[PDB]
């Protein structure tokens, strides 16, 4: 069903499926509270967004759960990184919650993850990523991150076609299309890295809503 879409039809479907930017409600306990509260509310919207991702509905309930459990933090992070593009050196968790690295020192071991998140944002800023490319990358994360543990791969190929199609519209040469495609996908390797580091840091803080606790225990 999703394989019959055109490149422009894929883009418009992803753009219209974009989740809203939610708002947030000093100390370490308060800062941790705001982030986890914001993350929990955001998870609800992500799930509805996932069902709007072309091909995701074709998957069984069990497989949908597995993909979300594996990529939920990656999806949150790339969304945060995307929102923070027009704010160098800062992370826009919410419109009323803009933080820097020194504010990340409020929580122990949070500054390291902050630096990585900030580095990804400047990387997106250097390249500078387009919204059409962003929604493609985020959907790739959802379908790829947990594909290990035929259909999904065919949908993945289609998003690749969409990414190339977008770059062809921008006026990029054939060689520039290959290179930019590679540059974007290699970033996903580090988004995965940040997620794993953020996963273990969050599990230590746990030892949170029951939904977050379900997501965390899935990786434990």
């Amino acid at each position: 069903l999703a394989l019959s879409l055109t490149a422009d039809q894929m883009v418009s479907a992803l753009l219209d499926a974009e989740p809203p930017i939610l708002y947030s409600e000093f100390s370490e306990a308060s800062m941790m509270g705001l982030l986890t509260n914001l993350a929990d509310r955001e998870l609800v919207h992500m799930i509805n967004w996932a069902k709007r991702v072309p091909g995701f509905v074709d998957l069984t309930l069990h497989d949908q759960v597995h993909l979300l459990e594996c990529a939920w933090l990656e999806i949150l992070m790339i969304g945060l990184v995307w929102r923070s593009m027009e704010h160098p050196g800062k992370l826009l968790f919410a419109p009323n919650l803009l933080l820097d690295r020194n504010q990340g020192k409020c929580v122990e071991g949070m500054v390291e993850i902050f630096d990585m998140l900030l580095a990804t944002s400047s990387r997106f800023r250097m390249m500078n990523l387009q919204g059409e490319e962003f929604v493609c990358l985020k959907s790739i994360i959802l379908l790829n991150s947990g594909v290990y543990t035929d259909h999904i791969h065919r949908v993945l190929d289609k998003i690749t076609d969409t990414l190339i199609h977008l770059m062809a519209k921008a006026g990029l040469t054939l060689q520039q299309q290959h290179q930019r495609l590679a540059q974007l996908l290699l970033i996903l390797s580090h988004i995965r890295h940040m997620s794993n580091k953020g996963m273990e840091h969050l599990y230590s803080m746990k030892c949170l809503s029951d939904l977050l606790l379900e997501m965390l225990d899935a990786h434990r």
């Binding site: 309930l61 759960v65 379900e214």
Partner: peptide, 8 residues
């Protein structure tokens, strides 16, 4: 599972 309900 909470994730099951939200997906449905």
């Amino acid at each position: 599972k909470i994730l099951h309900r939200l997906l449905q």
